[PDB]
Design a protein around this ligand. Structure first.
Ligand SMILES: O=C(O)CCCC[C@@H]1CCSS1
Length: 241
């Protein structure tokens, strides 16, 4: 089956990037071409939809250091991104609300992709959502987390997007979200492009979809702009004013 590969990234505006990402999710109609989107964000902390900013991050350190706060539309915990972090989102038709199985199948895809790069990894073991590593939504290179993910479902559509640490500043990560995380490049000598290419092939093989490069539609673009103008660009959305 043919998919859409969207190489669609606004690294200098994380809030707009997130607007793009709900936009593609919400524009999706059951039976549409499944979407695989790759993107990076400059220095940024992205918190879960339901999180209290000042409980989860050092907002004073962040402002002092020019790190953008951005709230995403999926739940889950807070993460630090920079240009060393590769993000990706998968939107597909859905006939059920079995989110566990979604994470399971996307993690298989990620594991297959990393195998291509010579890196052995598994999904974490634990259900406890509050713990920092080894969750079933994490991907673990042994004891170290190298990737986390969040997702959402509605009638007819699912979304699952993930942040992979390729060559992220792990010291900035630890400072802003206040030994357990690692970069992919701590294990194998690879570029972001090589990682992206492995993920394309791995997701294609695992999901049996051929993701061909495409652009966003006028409808997807206009919704993203609306979501940004009315929501993602605002302090109320991000800070929860
Ligand atoms: O590590 C976690 O537990 C949450 C991962 C959230 C991934 C999002 C991908 C696009 S924005 S941040």
């Amino acid at each position: 089956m043919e998919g859409r590969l969207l190489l669609l990234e606004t690294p200098g505006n994380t809030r707009m990037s997130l607007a793009y990402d709900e936009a593609i999710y919400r524009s999706f109609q059951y039976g549409d071409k499944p979407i695989l989107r790759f993107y990076r964000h400059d220095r940024s902390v992205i918190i879960g939809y339901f999180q209290v900013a000042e409980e989860e991050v050092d907002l004073d350190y962040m402002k002092k250091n020019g790190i953008m706060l951005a709230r995403r539309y999926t739940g889950g915990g807070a993460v630090y991104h920079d240009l060393g972090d590769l993000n990706f989102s998968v939107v597909r038709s859905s006939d059920d609300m079995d989110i566990t199985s979604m994470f399971r199948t996307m993690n298989e895809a990620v594991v297959n992709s990393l195998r291509i790069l010579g890196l052995d990894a598994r999904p974490g073991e634990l259900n406890d959502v509050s713990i920092p590593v080894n969750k079933k939504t994490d991907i673990m290179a042994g004891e170290k987390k190298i990737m986390g993910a969040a997702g959402a479902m509605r009638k007819g559509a699912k979304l699952w997007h993930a942040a992979m640490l390729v060559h992220t500043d792990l010291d900035m990560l630890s400072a802003v979200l206040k030994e357990r995380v690692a970069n992919v490049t701590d294990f194998v000598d690879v570029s972001i492009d090589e990682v992206r290419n492995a993920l394309i092939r791995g997701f294609s093989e695992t999901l049996h979809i051929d993701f061909r490069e495409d652009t966003i539609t006028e409808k997807e673009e206009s919704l993203a702009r609306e979501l940004f103008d009315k929501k993602y660009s605002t302090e109320e959305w991000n800070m929860g004013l």
